[PDB]
Each structure stands twice: as structure tokens, then as C-alpha cells.
């Protein structure tokens, strides 16, 4: 009773296909045609943070837009004061291969993770003045690729075992389990109201999730290769994904389609990181060819290039007030642009 | 007015940097190795959670070997974490399924990855005793073995069969065919023959890591 189920799935796919095709009456290019361009966007590197011994995989800003954490595979989480280029903490880890780092919006906690299959929470606000491990979350069967805080007690993780998970930090137990991907999940992005999040795995698919009930709401296809980065639009009604096929793409949640593609013939390297600006007009993307291209979101134009790294750009992040952007790379340097 | 809350930050940065200067010296004095192998390759034998660490020490040199335990058989996203390693220790069951060809395909993918272009491979061609035991009691899966002649630069063991010598050197040449087709002087391959009982494997890895460090230092002077 297998081919009949597959033909039912096929006719459901066809119904979804033409139900999406009936909604595309015009293109985003047709509508933002007469909008004025943004011009050449020139940025300057304002700080270069030094101190990591090996390549940087992850970084995350604090919600005060002054502090940022970074993770390097020499086994250190270094917290920085971006305004004064001073180190506030240097946390040694029990596993060298860290691949994700998260900053809690309260500012009290930091979470790292990697090939140890464990999400370790750290407490930056202690009595003895020592940053110690609060809890180590076990239960994933593959490596951790992404982790994002929701409160001081909840955290969502992404693993290489094709699963996302919701955790309850005070009990250490996995509450909700998000299944559905057929390849390893690489990135997460939370919605601005923390009721939804979207994941991008190495099966050329993006999926929307309900944090409350644990159900998949929508699935988005269109990329040809593995998705490596997802970011939400600042209003929560759209998101952007970067892949190994050298294209970023914009999706809507109410139209269930793709609205724009951002590609050039001179770009043949994959995309590592994706971030929007505060207005949502600029899309910043880090590439494997050591650069970072700025895009116009409502159009498909390059507004500028952030050049200055000497190895693969690994992580991007725009502050909560949009004042600056931070880039890390395998040259073991962090650069802040403005 | 606010300078009292800036000298504290400067003192904290002083202390952090004075610790990081010790971390840098303990980091650069250690050589990290990735122990990779296929199924039934005897990898856990020559070893003598997602990652299994194992530290050893040869002539006051600290080594740090790593083995992937819990990960799936996808590898294209977590093998990129293993640049900056001194070498990749690759183990093959050199003896149901054509697992020798699976090992050749994995080696071809590792040697030709955009990010592994600078990492060297120490090839441990394992199970030579079983290879002899089987060739005493192959060209069906490798047609070019009917044309293969033993290299006259061979270094056989005393009293050994000219059959098992030819078989083992055929497999070594199958791997060197991939190793020599690319590289352009960026990374090197070190093939070895390891049996069931070999204490010399740690010494072999030591000598090969020494060679890699020497060649990197020479390339920094544009001498090679």
C-alpha cells in the first residue's frame, strides 16, 4: 500500500502547486519598479576585535547592542564590549568544536554547542564572580548547529539529527520535539513575537513551526542546494534564506511563495550568513569568497560590498537598533562596520 | 565621574589577555588529529557522546586525536570543522559490499574538498594479515589488477609471498592515483601498511607529523 500513498501525496503536491500559482498575479519587481534606488552604500570598519586563536563560527549580539559573544574552535567564548574593544569574559569550554552561540535577551546567560551534541548554558551573573556552567542539555543524537533563547528558562536548539527541540532549562528536559526534515538542520530564526520560528535544513527546504503546539504550518521550497542561513523580516511576515547555490531568496508567509531572488553571475560561492537591516530595506549576506554583499530587498540590486576579511565569512549580525553590523570569519577576527 | 567604571574594564581586559597568552602557548604546542575510517576497518583497534577525544604523548610532544562517534553518515557539514588539523588519519580495511571502493570515493571527496585543500592525510592500509590469508586461499572487482606489475622500488618483508606484495602495492597505487592527480603542492599523503599487531603506528604518526611541519615551514620561505 505504498504507490497509492505516493500518488495521493503527488496529487496533494499538485493541488498545493496550482493553489500557489493562482496567487501570483504580479511580481515584487513589478510593484517596486518605480521606487527610488538606495544608492551606493559605503561602510567602514570601525573596530577589529582580536584575541581568538582559531576560526570563528558563531556570534550573537546582546539586546543592549554593546555586548556581543563569539565562539571560536580553540574552545573559548569571549564576550566583548564593542564600544571600547574590551573583553568582559573569556569562558573555557569542555569541548573545542563549538559551532553555535546564543546570548540571552535578559543578558544573564550564554549558550554554546557543537559536535559534543550538548547545549551548555552559562551563568554570567554569579555571586562568586565566576562564570560557571548552569546546565548541560543532553538528548540530541547529532551535532548542534543553532540555539536561540526564548526566555531565561526556554531555549530552542537545532541539530544534525534532522530535529529541532524545545527545552526547559530549570528541569533540563526536552519539552517539544519538532520533526519533519529529511536532512540536517543548519539554522533557526525566531519570530519577533516568539510564537513561531523557521528552520532551514540540508534538504533545500524551509519549514515554519508553532512553538506552542509543535506543528508544522508551512513548508517552503525553491532553493537548489542546502540552506545555510535564515533570517526573519523585521515585521515577521517574511524571511530570507541563503544556500550553497549562491542565491538568497525571499519568502512570504501569507502567500506561501518566493517573491525575490538575489543572485549575480559573478557569484559562484555559497552563502554563509543572512541578516536584514532595521527598516528591512537592506539584506546583508556573507559569502565563501571572503566578502559580504549588501542587497536592496525590495529590488534585486547590490548596494555595496563589505570587503576586508581574509578567509570565509562565517557569521553576520545587525544590532537591535541597526547602528552597526558585525562580521566574523576564519581569519579569527571580528569586524564592526558602520 | 565615569572613569572609575572604565579602569575596572581595563583591569579585566588585562587579566583576560594575560590568561589568553598562556592559552595560546598551550594551543600551539599541541597537534590535533582526526581519526577517520570506514566500517570494519579496525580503527578502534589502532586507537590503542558526539566526539571521542584521546590524548597521547611522544617525545615530549602532546597529541590530541579525535574520533566522531554519534554523527550520521552525511559528513559534508561537520568535516568542514576539521581544517587546522595537522593530519587526517584515514584507515582502510585493505582486504558483501565493495567497501574498498567506498573508501576510495571517501578519500577522493576528502582530497578534493575546497576546504580540505591544505590538510594532509596519513593513510593506514589495515588488515594485511587478512589480505595475505585471502590471497593465499580480486581482478573481478578491479580489472586493472590483471595488468598490474609490482613496482621495482618495492620494500618487501623477508620471506613474504610475491602475491600479497603485489596485492598490497596495487591498493596503495589505487590510492596514490587520486593523491597525485591533484594537490599542486598544498598537502601530502603518507601511506602505511598496518597489521593486527603493530606498536609502531604511533611512531609512524609522529614521523609523519614532523614531516608535515617541516614542509609547511619550508613553504613559508618559498623553498619548496
Amino acid at each position, epitope marked *: 500500500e505504498l504507490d497509492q500513498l505516493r500518488q495521493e501525496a503527488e496529487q496533494l503536491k499538485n493541488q498545493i502547486r496550482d493553489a500557489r500559482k493562482a496567487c501570483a498575479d504580479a511580481t515584487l519587481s513589478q510593484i517596486t519598479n518605480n521606487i527610488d534606488p538606495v544608492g551606493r552604500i559605503q561602510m567602514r570598519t570601525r573596530r577589529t576585535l582580536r584575541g581568538h586563536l582559531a576560526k570563528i563560527y558563531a556570534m550573537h549580539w546582546g539586546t543592549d547592542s554593546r555586548l556581543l559573544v563569539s565562539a571560536s574552535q580553540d574552545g573559548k567564548l569571549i564576550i566583548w564590549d564593542s564600544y571600547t574593544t574590551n573583553k568582559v569574559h573569556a569562558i573555557p569550554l569542555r569541548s573545542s568544536w563549538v559551532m553555535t552561540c546564543a546570548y540571552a535577551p535578559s543578558g544573564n546567560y550564554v549558550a554554546c554547542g557543537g559536535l559534543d551534541n550538548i547545549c551548555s548554558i552559562y551563568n554570567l551573573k554569579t555571586r562568586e564572580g565566576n562564570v560557571r556552567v548552569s546546565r548541560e542539555l543532553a538528548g540530541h543524537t547529532g551535532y548542534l548547529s543553532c540555539c536561540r533563547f526564548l526566555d531565561d528558562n526556554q531555549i530552542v536548539t537545532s541539530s544534525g539529527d534532522t530535529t529541532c527541540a524545545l527545552w526547559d532549562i530549570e528541569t533540563g528536559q526536552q519539552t517539544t520535539t519538532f520533526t519533519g526534515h529529511t536532512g540536517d538542520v543548519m539554522s533557526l530564526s525566531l519570530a519577533p513575537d516568539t510564537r513561531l520560528f523557521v528552520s532551514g535544513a540540508c534538504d533545500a527546504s524551509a519549514k515554519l513551526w508553532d512553538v506552542r503546539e509543535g506543528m508544522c504550518r508551512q513548508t517552503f521550497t525553491g532553493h537548489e542546494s542546502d540552506i545555510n542561513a535564515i533570517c526573519f523580516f523585521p515585521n515577521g511576515n517574511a524571511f530570507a534564506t541563503g544556500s550553497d547555490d549562491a542565491t538568497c531568496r525571499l519568502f512570504d508567509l501569507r502567500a506561501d511563495q518566493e517573491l525575490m531572488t538575489y543572485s549575480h553571475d559573478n557569484i*559562484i560561492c555559497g552563502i554563509t550568513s543572512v541578516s536584514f537591516s532595521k527598516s528591512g530595506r537592506l539584506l546583508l549576506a556573507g559569502y565563501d569568497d571572503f566578502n559580504c554583499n549588501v542587497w536592496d530587498a525590495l529590488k534585486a540590486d547590490r548596494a555595496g560590498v563589505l570587503a576586508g576579511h581574509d578567509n570565509r565569512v562565517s557569521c553576520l549580525g545587525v544590532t537591535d537598533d541597526g547602528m552597526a553590523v558585525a562580521t566574523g570569519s576564519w581569519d579569527s577576527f571580528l569586524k564592526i562596520w558602520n | 565621574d565615569q572613569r572609575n567604571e572604565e579602569k575596572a574594564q581595563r583591569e579585566a581586559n588585562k587579566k583576560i589577555e594575560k590568561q589568553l597568552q598562556k592559552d595560546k602557548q598551550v594551543y600551539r604546542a599541541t597537534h590535533r588529529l582526526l581519526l577517520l575510517g570506514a566500517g570494519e576497518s579496525g580503527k578502534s583497534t589502532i586507537v590503542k557522546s558526539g566526539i571521542f577525544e584521546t590524548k597521547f604523548q611522544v617525545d615530549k610532544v602532546n597529541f590530541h586525536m579525535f574520533d566522531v562517534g554519534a554523527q550520521r553518515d*552525511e559528513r*559534508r557539514k561537520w568535516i568542514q570543522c576539521f581544517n587546522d588539523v595537522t593530519a587526517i588519519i584515514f584507515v582502510v580495511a585493505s582486504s558483501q559490499t565493495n567497501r574498498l571502493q*567506498a573508501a576510495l570515493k571517501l578519500f577522493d571527496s576528502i582530497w578534493n574538498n575546497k576546504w580540505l585543500r591544505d590538510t594532509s592525510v596519513i593513510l593506514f592500509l589495515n588488515k594485511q594479515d587478512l589480505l595475505a590469508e585471502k590471497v593465499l586461499a580480486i581482478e573481478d572487482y578491479f580489472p586493472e589488477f590483471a595488468r598490474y606489475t609490482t613496482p621495482e622500488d618495492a620494500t618487501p618483508e623477508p620471506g613474504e609471498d610475491p602475491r600479497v606484495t603485489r596485492a598490497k602495492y596495487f591498493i596503495r597505487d589505487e590510492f596514490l592515483r587520486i593523491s597525485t592527480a591533484s594537490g599542486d603542492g598544498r598537502h601530502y599523503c603518507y601511506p602505511h601498511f598496518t597489521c593486527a599487531v603493530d606498536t609502531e603506528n604511533i611512531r609512524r604518526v609522529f614521523n609523519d607529523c614532523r614531516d608535515i611541519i617541516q614542509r609547511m615551514h619550508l613553504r613559508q620561505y618559498e623553498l619548496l
Partner: nanobody
Amino acid sequence: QVQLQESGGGLVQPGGSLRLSCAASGFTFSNYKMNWVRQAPGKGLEWVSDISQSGASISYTGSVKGRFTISRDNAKNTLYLQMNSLKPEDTAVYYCARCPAPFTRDCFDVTSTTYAYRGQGTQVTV
């Protein structure tokens, strides 16, 4: 969507010949190296042959050399395997697989149990 559709399987009394086709929609077929992988009953996934972006570099496993020919047609988005002089040990489900990344020479995990860029396969029986 990245979709691969095979056809051309069936029954061949030993010694005959078959042609397998693979229709590919959902990606730029010219930027990708393609593969042919099979699964014998009670066995794992094995690698049969591969072909580059342009059909310049071609490789086969030793058990099929001189008997199979892989070929592309980058214009009509199709891939072929001409199975000539079939032995009774060639019975397997044959899958059309794609390397995961454009403009690359390495293909890591085509013979994995859960690989996304691979069709449902066709069953040839000798």
C-alpha cells in the same frame, strides 16, 4: 523542487541489455555532477558511475567497466545509463543521484541512507 525521476527498469533474461533514463527538474542541470547508485537486496547503497558537468570526466566501478556507459544531455535535462551484457548479480534498484553543490569536484554523501538529492529509483531484475 529538486526532483529526479527514473525510468527504464524491468526484466532481462541474463545477457540482454537495458537503458535507464533520469528526468531532472528543479535545478540548473549543467552545474551539477551526476551519479548512478544502486542497492542490491539485503545490501547497502553502492556507487556505479558518475559524470561531470560537461561529459568530460567519466568514471565507473570495476565490476561494470566495459559494460555500462553513462551519458548526459544538458539541453533536455536527462541522464542515461546503457546497461549492456547484464550478469545475474546486477539485479538492484538503481537510483539517479546528484552531488549536493554546484561547481565542485567532490561529492560526499551520495550513497547515504537518507540523502535528499536522489530519486525513488527503478528496479531492474535479471
